[PDB]
């Protein structure tokens, strides 16, 4: 009753693609049907109350099975769910319905949710980004390049005032943003109200001395919603332009509320993806990051960490580029090479800045600019704070490298091919960049 | 051997590079045009550089394919407002954004 190979999905249906690794011997159509049932009705055996309902309507149906290229032990199951199975404007409900129970199904060795098609009629019920890329650029007055940020380290042990000192020195050197670590909420060594006040002083001081708008992603991730909103309110009260939330660990209910609050109060929202690798790393069991990307765009954020792309080998980058498109673009066509199983239309829902972070330094700049283009935030932690002349100098080196790569790009140069030359030429006018290049040059013995 | 970082006011994109000569400015105009963006010129008093709304010089140069005419207008705007900061922008109608924006003369 759940395997319906003649079913043509409606344009309003939510669709899911599950990669199923069945127990050897289990019939593919039976497994697909079982996953459709558990993720909609939960059961195969009819009880009398079922007969009170329109059973043909209110069920998921598996409508297509495909081989997984390269993996004979698995198959893709495509399942369609009527739009009415779900609470409107609720990523929480869609997620709970799709993934609440089925991952424990004992007749499969593993289940992986690869993609979910959110129909436009459902997308229109969700708040989405508080601002999105283009509004954020207008509010911050920043055009024509990627934005630059830095996470303050160490993550532990700094007072509010010392933390603010680090923030101030980074911002004055040319970074647009600094960032709270995901684990910085309110700790004995640095209580949140003190952090917010000293960070805002740092931000204002650096802004005055550079004449460029600055911000610092103040983490409002908190034990309860009351605390989260109190911290968000205080950021607004003191004039902070941007806050941060850990959407998976704080959770989707909290995130969606906070994003609505940010939209209502003009505050930008940076989203950290802490814990994603618990869920998204195993290729045979869990939820692919591209699904978590769609969920965040609907729940809402103005920036989202996406991975750096450059940290993977050249043949392994396509999926990352796919979810970056899902995050930023209005319409993303099906493309199996990039792991996009369904066309995804966002309509007019704005895109979200892709944030590249993790182990990057000035020598990655040409590739980062080429791969991400302008609507990205490039975060440099060790690559700013580790500059031998300190944070302002570190920031300035990254800023010069970025601007030199963008200018070269705009001139029509192949900036990856000519990256060393572009950086070297810029370093002739920037002592800070010249020594940064020395600091992070890969030494080969 | 540590060198102290010298603080000064900045002016957004490209302001961490040396100021552009004619050749470098022309290359940016040609880029903007190749992207289908409409060049525009703005100016403002130095103290008001952070304003969201600068004075527009004439109107945006819609359909303009001639790089030299845009550069000539930049120079003409400078002549009209010799103490002002002068910015080149390029309007992207599909994004409702600016594809490019930078300060050509930093003001005085």
UniProtKB/Swiss-Prot annotation, chain A:
Function summary: RuBisCO catalyzes two reactions: the carboxylation of D-ribulose 1,5-bisphosphate, the primary event in carbon dioxide fixation, as well as the oxidative fragmentation of the pentose substrate. Both reactions occur simultaneously and in competition at the same active site. There are estimated to be 270 RuBisCO heterohexadecamers per carboxysome. Alpha-carboxysomes are able to assemble in the absence of RuBisCO, unlike beta-carboxysomes. The RuBisCO large subunit is required for enzyme integration into carboxysomes; replacing it with the carboxysomally targeted gene (Tcr_0838, AC Q31HD9) of H.crungenus places RuBisCO in the carboxysome, while the non-carboxysomal large subunit of H.crungenus (Tcr_0427, AC Q31IK0) is not incorporated in the carboxysome.
InterPro entries: RuBisCO, RuBisCo_large_chain_AS, RuBisCO_lsu_C, RuBisCO_lsu_C_sf, RuBisCO_lsu_fd_N, RuBisCO_lsu_N_sf, RuBisCO_lsuI
Record's note on what induces expression: Produced when grown in air or in air supplemented with 5% CO(2) (at protein level). Part of the cbbL-cbbS operon.
Known outcome of mutating residue 57 to R: No longer binds N-repeats in CsoS2A
Name of the protein in its database record: Ribulose bisphosphate carboxylase large chain
Cellular location(s): Carboxysome
Catalytically driven reaction(s): 2 (2R)-3-phosphoglycerate + 2 H(+) = D-ribulose 1,5-bisphosphate + CO2 + H2O; D-ribulose 1,5-bisphosphate + O2 = 2-phosphoglycolate + (2R)-3-phosphoglycerate + 2 H(+)
Record's comment describing the protein's domains: The N-terminus (minimally 1-122, fragment 1-136 does not bind any better) interacts with the shell proteins CsoS1A, CsoS1B and CsoS1C. A slightly longer fragment of the N-terminus (residues 1-136) is required for targeting to carboxysomes, and will direct foreign proteins to the carboxysome, with reduced efficiency compared to the whole protein.
Record-annotated active site: 153 (proton acceptor), 272 (proton acceptor)
Disruption phenotype: Does not grow in air, grows poorly in air supplemented with 5% CO(2), a high-CO(2) requiring phenotype (hcr), has apolar effect on expression of downstream cbbS. Expresses type II but not type I RuBisCO, does not form carboxysomes but instead smaller, empty cytoplasmic inclusions. A double ccbL-ccbS deletion is hcr and forms empty but otherwise normal appearing carboxysomes. Required for growth in ambient air.
Short name of one Pfam family: RuBisCO_large
Note: The basic functional RuBisCO is composed of a large chain homodimer in a 'head-to-tail' conformation. In form I RuBisCO this homodimer is arranged in a barrel-like tetramer with the small subunits forming a tetrameric 'cap' on each end of the 'barrel'.
Gene expressing this chain: cbbL
Ranges where the record places region Necessary and sufficient to target proteins to carboxysomes, interacts with shell proteins: 1-121
Cofactor: Mg(2+)
One GO process term, biological-process aspect: reductive pentose-phosphate cycle
Sites annotated Transition state stabilizer: 312
Enzyme Commission code: 4.1.1.39
SUPFAM superfamilies xrefs: RuBisCo, C-terminal domain, RuBisCO, large subunit, small (N-terminal) domain
Cofactor annotation comment: Binds 1 Mg(2+) ion per subunit.
From Swiss-Prot, chain B:
Subcellular localization(s) per the UniProt record: Carboxysome
GO CC terms: carboxysome
Alphabetized GO MF terms: ribulose-bisphosphate carboxylase activity
Subunit composition and interactions: Heterohexadecamer of 8 large and 8 small subunits. Interacts with CsoS2. Forms a CsoS2-CsoS1-RuBisCO complex. Holo-RuBisCO interacts with the N-terminal repeats of CsoS2; binding is sensitive to ionic strength. A fusion of a single N-terminal repeat to the C-terminus of the large subunit of RuBisCO (cbbL) shows the repeat can lie between a CbbL dimer, making minor contacts to CbbS; thus each RuBisCO holoenzyme could bind 8 repeats.
InterPro entries: RuBisCO_ssu, RuBisCO_ssu_dom, RuBisCO_ssu_sf
Biotechnology: Expression of 10 genes for alpha-carboxysome (Cb) proteins (cbbL-cbbS-csoS2-csoS3-csoS4A-csoS4B-csoS1C-csoS1A-csoS1B-csoS1D) in E.coli generates compartments that resemble Cb, contain RuBisCO and have its catalytic activity, showing it is possible to make artificial, functional Cb using these 10 genes. Cargo proteins can be targeted to these organelles. Alpha-carboxysomes are assembled in the complete absence of this enzyme in this bacteria, suggesting carboxysome-based microcompartments can be designed for applications such as custom chemical reactors or delivery vehicles.
Alphabetical keyword list: Bacterial microcompartment, Calvin cycle, Carbon dioxide fixation, Carboxysome
Recorded phenotype for the gene knockout or disruption: A double ccbL-ccbS deletion does not grow in air, grows well with 5% CO(2), a high-CO(2) requiring phenotype (hcr) and forms empty but otherwise normal appearing carboxysomes. Required for growth in ambient air.
Family recorded in the similarity comment: Belongs to the RuBisCO small chain family.
Broad class of where this protein is predominantly found: other
Protein name: Ribulose bisphosphate carboxylase small subunit
Note: The basic functional RuBisCO is composed of a large chain homodimer in a 'head-to-tail' conformation. In form I RuBisCO this homodimer is arranged in a barrel-like tetramer with the small subunits forming a tetrameric 'cap' on each end of the 'barrel'.
GO biological process, one term: reductive pentose-phosphate cycle
Highest taxon listed in the record's lineage: Bacteria
Induction line: Produced when grown in air or in air supplemented with 5% CO(2). Part of the ccbL-ccbS operon.
Gene3D superfamilies: Ribulose bisphosphate carboxylase, small subunit
Function: RuBisCO catalyzes two reactions: the carboxylation of D-ribulose 1,5-bisphosphate, the primary event in carbon dioxide fixation, as well as the oxidative fragmentation of the pentose substrate. Both reactions occur simultaneously and in competition at the same active site. There are estimated to be 270 RuBisCO heterohexadecamers per carboxysome.
